[PDB]
Amino acid sequence: RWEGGYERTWEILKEDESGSLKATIEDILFKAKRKRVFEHHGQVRLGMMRHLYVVVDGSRTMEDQDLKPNRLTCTLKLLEYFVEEYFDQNPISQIGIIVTKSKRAEKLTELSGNPRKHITSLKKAVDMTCHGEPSLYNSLSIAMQTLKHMPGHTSREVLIIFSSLTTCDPSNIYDLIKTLKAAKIRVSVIGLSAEVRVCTVLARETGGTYHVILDESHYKELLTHHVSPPPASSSSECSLIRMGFPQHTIASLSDQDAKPSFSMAHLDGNTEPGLTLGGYFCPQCRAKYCELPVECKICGLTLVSAPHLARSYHHLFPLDAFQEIPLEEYNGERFCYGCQGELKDQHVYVCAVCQNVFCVDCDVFVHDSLHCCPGCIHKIPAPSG
């Protein structure tokens, strides 16, 4: 019965085209198993200066293995990567690390952009018991009251790491729809390997996007989907003003070494508990402390540092696309317009405008690293006007 039936599963899958060329097409189906969802982007409108809120379910669902030795191990490790790749892409923003554990919510790291503080917090978050049940109501309470004091010229989005369990919290979180719909705060959850309808209704009543974790690769995809600053609901803001352009200071300008250290509890700046020698300078406090392209606590305006953060999204929107042809128009001497090679896996990648020939390793290098076709350069800037 089943001793045969356990091996009726194996026997055919083992078997293939016999005689010659055996265990060959089994490898071909594995390549045919590949090539999942690429981009499907092309959007406009919103996404600028997010104010994210990490919300972590700490529950007994973590004790199931399912991808890793812990579901936090699946979670927490790639959050650091998600932190770094965020600060890579979006430095104009800041993130609220808030942890739910034992039916409450602990705002673990404040809404800020200092990566080491966030990452070591995750390195502190390693040895978490995740005792108790999730409570989103305490999480939204922090999320309200913090972002309540943020301007309406702020992007208001929440990223919830939920372990798909029972949403164990009172006090009419169904009525928190109209609370937060009016409060123009977006809330995005993704479910860990299952679905919560109420939370699925929550996000579809939000405009925040809900998903379910499939796999570790798939876990990365939706992170990567939420790296990009999304086009949230209309009528948020237009502008955001008193973007402080700073100065770097060399502390060697006119008076050479007239100050042994530029942090002595009286100097304009010197914000954090450490010694400094003068590296930076804000306009409004005239605040000189450790360099930070974010904001301050006395002038209270945004320490904008343009080549970093006014450059990051500044080309992250205006992209175009390529096309693929299997044909052989042999442009070059059977070459690439970029790296100049050939393999011909029938993916001759042609630009939409300048129409230049590329490979996967030239398409990926654009569509992950270069983000534009340089074949448009020499082609845009020469007749540009």
Partner: protein, 235 residues
């Protein structure tokens, strides 16, 4: 060994339920056989340690012999699912809690079988009814005494989906399946779905099945059998 002949049978209906409770979210309406059966069902459940995680995962909606208190949990179940709670309802197939609902993907999307859903109660209402159909077709003892259970089974069980994407986890905890469940299930429903290669599915193994089921089935929905114009297809 009947609903009160041994509880060793009953030692693992909790186990096959709690793990169903642990995996499956979003409200479940299961079907017992009768009220004293239901009274027998929860009889070991209090005194022996059963609910110790069952109330901790979802909550439970007892349906009463009296229809007054039976309508109460109902007021709860439509509410206690649509808030932060799964709240699995517990009910009886042959009892009149099983009509008039049409459960939606909103609340109620899974059903667990519990036993052969036959009569087992009224004495000797059978025999004259039996012998008259034996005066009509003469081999019917074996025959409809299967289907009477079956005609009530998917009457109860096949309810929780309305449109056609609404989900349904209609598992079959049953000892009598060999022909009877197969004869009683719809010919559209035995064919593509029932026992494709999954018959003697131990719950611990069948855990990952619904896991594999839902997780895939929750995502990627846009297009599902889209008809526009008339293109023959001819079934």
């Amino acid at each position: 060994f009947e609903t009160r002949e041994d509880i060793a049978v009953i030692r693992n209906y909790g186990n096959l339920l709690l793990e169903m409770s642990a995996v499956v979210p979003d409200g479940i309406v299961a079907f017992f056989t009768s009220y004293q059966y239901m009274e027998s069902t929860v009889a070991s459940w209090y005194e022996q340690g059963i609910l110790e995680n069952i109330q901790r995962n979802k909550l439970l909606f007892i349906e009463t012999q009296d229809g007054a208190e039976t309508s109460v949990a109902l007021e709860k179940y439509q509410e206690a699912c649509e808030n932060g709670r799964g709240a699995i309802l517990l009910s009886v197939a042959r009892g009149k809690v099983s009509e008039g609902i049409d459960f939606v993907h909103h609340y109620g999307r899974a059903v667990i079988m519990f036993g052969v859903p036959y009569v087992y109660t009224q004495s000797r209402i059978l025999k004259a009814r039996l012998e008259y159909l034996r005066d009509q077709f003469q081999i019917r003892e074996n025959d409809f005494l299967t289907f009477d259970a079956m005609r009530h089974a998917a009457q109860c069980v096949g309810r929780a989906i309305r449109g056609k994407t609404d989900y349904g986890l209609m598992v079959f905890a049953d000892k009598r399946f060999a022909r009877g469940d197969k004869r009683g299930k719809l010919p559209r429903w035995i064919q593509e779905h029932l026992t494709d290669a999954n018959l003697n599915l131990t719950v611990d193994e069948g855990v990952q099945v619904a896991k594999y089921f839902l997780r895939q089935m929750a995502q990627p929905f846009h297009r599902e059998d889209q008809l526009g114009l008339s293109l023959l297809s001819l079934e």
